[PDB]
Design a protein around this ligand. Sequence first.
Ligand SMILES: O=c1ccn([C@@H]2O[C@H](COP(=O)(O)OP(=O)(O)O)[C@@H](O)[C@H]2O)c(=O)[nH]1
Lengths: 234, 228
Amino acid sequence: NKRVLVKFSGEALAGDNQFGIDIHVLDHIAKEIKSLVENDIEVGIVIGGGNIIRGVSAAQGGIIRRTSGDYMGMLATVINAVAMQEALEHIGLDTRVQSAIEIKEICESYIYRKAIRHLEKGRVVIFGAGTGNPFFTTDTAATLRAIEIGSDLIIKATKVDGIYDKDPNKFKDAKKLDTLSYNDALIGDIEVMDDTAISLAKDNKLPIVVCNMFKKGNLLQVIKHQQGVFSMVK
Amino acid sequence: NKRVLVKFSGEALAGDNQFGIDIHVLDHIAKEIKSLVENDIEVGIVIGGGNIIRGVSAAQGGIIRRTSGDYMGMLATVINAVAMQEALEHIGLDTRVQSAIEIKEICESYIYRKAIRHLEKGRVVIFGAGTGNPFFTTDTAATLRAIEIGSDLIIKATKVDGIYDKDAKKLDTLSYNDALIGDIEVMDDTAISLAKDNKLPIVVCNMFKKGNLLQVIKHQQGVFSMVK
Ligand SMILES: O=c1ccn([C@@H]2O[C@H](COP(=O)(O)OP(=O)(O)O)[C@@H](O)[C@H]2O)c(=O)[nH]1
């Protein structure tokens, strides 16, 4: 019934180091997904590739074109998706990776009715390579998939409790914002997602939720009970 | 007329770090490749993925199946290949990436006859995804691609000048069996046997000394160790 899209930056998979994949961190995440699946919540997941490679970072040397740097990023998300698939299935869950870039040998291609059939049979669906367009941020791609599958909400999983007024690291006086309007997110200096993603979520009336997942049982509490610790853009 | 396969470990492209892609290193390699192309040497490149993911490391703990780890590693090689291509195209080299695993939108598949065709036209071919099979090594993949394209030799580009006994001497020439028997490792056993069976010489040399590669291929000089 309740269908959600959980979005992670690649860094979520890395832990204390900025690079790679921390196996312990991965298992932890998968167990938070498992609690959703056990409570009959349908879970789509998108993951960025920032733990492996970045668009404005590999291009700044002066020899990697903008599009090729993105294609490197897209391949990275597929690497992360396979890892996540494995962590999910290690703990007994059924999962499919639906990639926007065709790699038949490693995962299924994204097809609208296939992703839905999987979700309706209770499989976790991980969307690899966003939507295949290089120009889009992870946030935009996740919001797109979230609309495409008719999700009830999109969860942006971060390392921080929710949406704040200033960066919690750069300010002691940083105050968490519990509920925000789409426009409050657009005009204000504070950042949630990029402008395209927020505007996409606004027009299609998709609620955005920003929460920590380091907290055991929080995700379930957020999705099923509208409880736990989170921020909501509505 | 001379044809060559050059093998890089993923770790090689990471530079002064264990992880990632060093753009100064890729530039350096592109220049060396350029000197081969401009001297009419046909160049195939096989690139590793260890700077990003290795399947063995990935399977520790038993969360990721060894097989899925190896595919993750094979994808990482395509990422390196793509960055390698951009470094080459940047200095005006015509290149093609071919992957043992089909990634339709980003590069062409490995096709025996096309690879050769690209090389006849003076293009650099970068082979990603190794053999396309898990459980095999970059060394094996490189040796395979080398024999497939009809290489005059395979060059294992490493950080060291040649083959040594420790990380107290350097070893100039080696038999295939000497490489299969001894504690000194050049590549893994399956790559060496593949090379032996097909009479394919193996050069081990340093990637960082300028003009060296050109001298090994064109003149059989410069600094290097040889398994034959
Ligand atoms: O034919 C292949 C080629 C590579 N790989 C995987 O991808 C990585 C290759 O990159 P690496 O840099 O490690 O080669 P090496 O460093 O060992 O020379 C390996 O760890 C393997 O898990 C594979 O499974 N089959």
